[PDB]
């Protein structure tokens, strides 16, 4: 019947938290295997979404639309990573592929949430060209740290924004 937005948000936030946990674990696996010099630029990829720290600005339709766009970008980068990452990354390949599948599940839940709540369809941003292969095996590892680190932050700030937004419904 008629949807309860608080329940729809709850189930969407819960699923987001699970993906956040998966991402946090995989980033830790990678860091444990490549401690290197500590940390590298999360800006090591200019093609990834920027992190939106501005809470209280956007409303629910806008927050959801931008999250959908961000997640689709992360899915593109994860798919790219699994293909051209190199031998160094294939020890993470099962977890990466499961992360990609759960990323798709969250995208579908967001699409369902927007349909159930009658929120106008997000305008499709034109398609970015294919991601070029990393210039080196090290470059692929740096890309993996940036992709997983950025996804974690995106999901963390989405949970925060959706919970503070639900507080007012």
Author numbering: 10 to 178
From the paper:
IL-11 activates downstream signalling pathways by binding its two cell surface receptors: the IL-11 specific receptor, IL-11Rα, and the signal-transducing receptor, glycoprotein (gp)13013,26. Following the formation of the receptor complex, the Janus kinase (JAK)/signal transducer and activator of stat (STAT) and extracellular signal regulated kinase (ERK)/mitogen-activated protein kinase (MAPK) pathways are primarily activated. IL-11 and IL-6 utilise a homodimer of gp13026,34,35 while other IL-6 family members exploit a heterodimer of gp130 with a second signal-transducing receptor, such as LIF receptor (LIFR), OSM receptor (OSMR), IL-27R/WSX-1 or IL-12 receptor β−2 subunit (IL-12Rβ2).
Phage display was subsequently used to identify variants with higher inhibitory potency resulting in IL-11 Mutein, which contains W147A combined with mutations of AB loop residues 58–62, 58AMSAG62 to 58PAIDY62, that were reported to increase affinity to IL-11Rα43. In contrast, the AB loop of IL-11Δ10/Mutein shows significant conformational shifts relative to the WT structure caused by alterations in key contacts between the loop and the four-α-helical bundle. Thus, the 58PAIDY62 mutations alter the position of the AB-loop, shifting the register of key loop-core interactions by three residues, while maintaining the composition of the interacting residues. The result is that the bulk of the loop is shifted toward site-III and the N-terminal turn of helix-B is unfolded. We note that this configuration of the C-terminal segment of the AB-loop and N-terminal turn of helix-B resembles the structure of wild-type IL-11Δ10 bound within the hexameric complex.
